[PDB]
Amino acid sequence: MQDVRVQVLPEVRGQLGGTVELPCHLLPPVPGLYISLVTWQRPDAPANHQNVAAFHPKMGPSFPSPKPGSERLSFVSAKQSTGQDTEAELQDATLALHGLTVEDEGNYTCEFATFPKGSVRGMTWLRV
């Protein structure tokens, strides 16, 4: 079973008041690897305020910080299961920020909690 790694861009440039995407993908495809969770964190934030977005395969997204907050964040492509007919897909963890503010600038870390490989991460600087 191959190791997995988090593919990101090192820097993304956004426009104030606009939307920007932070690509994040778990590579390569590894049959049998289970993605238990994905999170986005601001690693330079106070330690108890690092998590800004999370995604669970069965329960979907959460946004455990008021800023940027649910209203200004979306998982662009991640899918949760909503019934017997639908399966989760967390491999593309790309995050969008909406209504960009100056306080949104900085480092963002995309982390996949996987089994059996454990947790792996990649970091992007959002420049606004």
Interaction of residue 89 with a second copy, rule CB under 8 A = no
Residue with tokens 């490989």: 117
Site string for Mg ion, 35-64 (x = CB under 5 A): -----------------------------x
- By the rule CB under 8 A, 119 interacts with a second copy: yes
31 binds a second copy (CB under 8 A): no
The one segment of 1-9, 34-42, 46-54, 74-82 that binds Cl ion by CB under 5 A = 1-9
- C-beta separation of 68 from 40 below 8 A: no
Rounded CA gap, 51 and 62, in Å? 10
For Cl ion, the closer CB: 2 or 70 = 2
CA 116 vs CA 1, 19, 119: distances in Å: 9, 35, 9
